[PDB]
């Protein structure tokens, strides 16, 4: 019923959110700057 359509939207959005996280793992990782742990600690 609207269930068929809510379940479609809900499975669809879980498929989109997962993909948006692979994308963010791609681009935000360019900003990651490692720490010299032996230096600050």
């Amino acid at each position: 019923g609207d269930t068929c359509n809510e379940e479609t939207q809900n499975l669809s959005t879980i498929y989109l959110r997962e993909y948006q996280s692979k994308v963010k793992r791609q681009i935000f990782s360019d900003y990651q700057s490692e720490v010299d742990i032996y230096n600050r600690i």
Binding site: D2, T3, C4, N5, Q9, S12, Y15, R17, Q20, I27
Partner: protein, 185 residues
């Protein structure tokens, strides 16, 4: 790669994070529960645009099909661009997922669920007066190593996502029976 003619300029595609579906202002904006339904996408028509409603943006398998489409939906535009896009699992081949129920089987579209992010756009050609300037402008923000291997998502993964209504005959036959959501068939 895949081609999509769009009237939306590169800097706008950048400002939005990609080629967005109708309604979705920018790619990571989870501030609008966008209706996403492939079956509903595949049957829609928007004047001025190649199918970009109901949460998917449509692309063609070739620069000429992309052009052909461009000259119908965008005829007489002084300028528009054809976007060369990389295959990745957010893309679904529509004929395969919808089977014999594909509304426009001839059009041979491949749809991206959620829009195409700017990182997936390999480049674009500029089209003036209907004529394709064959110098391709490369998107330097494209992530070459990451899209270099990826392919479209398999229709198996698409079947549960087809979006046919609860009562559509498809939910009771092969292959969709085997992937029908809670409340479909």
């Amino acid at each position: 790669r895949l081609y999509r003619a769009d009237s939306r300029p590169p800097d706008e595609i950048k400002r939005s994070g990609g080629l967005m579906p109708r309604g979705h202002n920018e790619y990571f904006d989870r501030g609008t529960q966008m209706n996403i339904n492939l079956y509903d996408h595949a049957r829609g028509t928007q004047t001025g645009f190649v199918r970009y409603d109901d949460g998917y943006v449509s692309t063609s398998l070739s620069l000429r099909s992309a052009h052909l489409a461009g000259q119908s939906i965008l005829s007489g535009y002084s300028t528009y661009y054809i976007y060369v896009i990389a295959t990745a699992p957010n893309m679904f081949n529509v004929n395969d997922v919808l089977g014999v129920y594909s509304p426009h089987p001839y059009e041979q579209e491949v749809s991206a669920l959620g829009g195409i992010p700017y990182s997936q756009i390999y480049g674009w050609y500029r089209v003036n007066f209907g004529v394709i300037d064959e110098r391709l402008h490369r998107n330097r923000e494209y992530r070459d190593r990451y899209y270099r291997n990826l392919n479209i998502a398999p229709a198996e993964d698409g079947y549960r996502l087809a979006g046919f209504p609860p009562d559509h005959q498809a939910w009771r036959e092969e292959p969709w029976i085997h992937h029908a959501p809670q409340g479909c068939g």
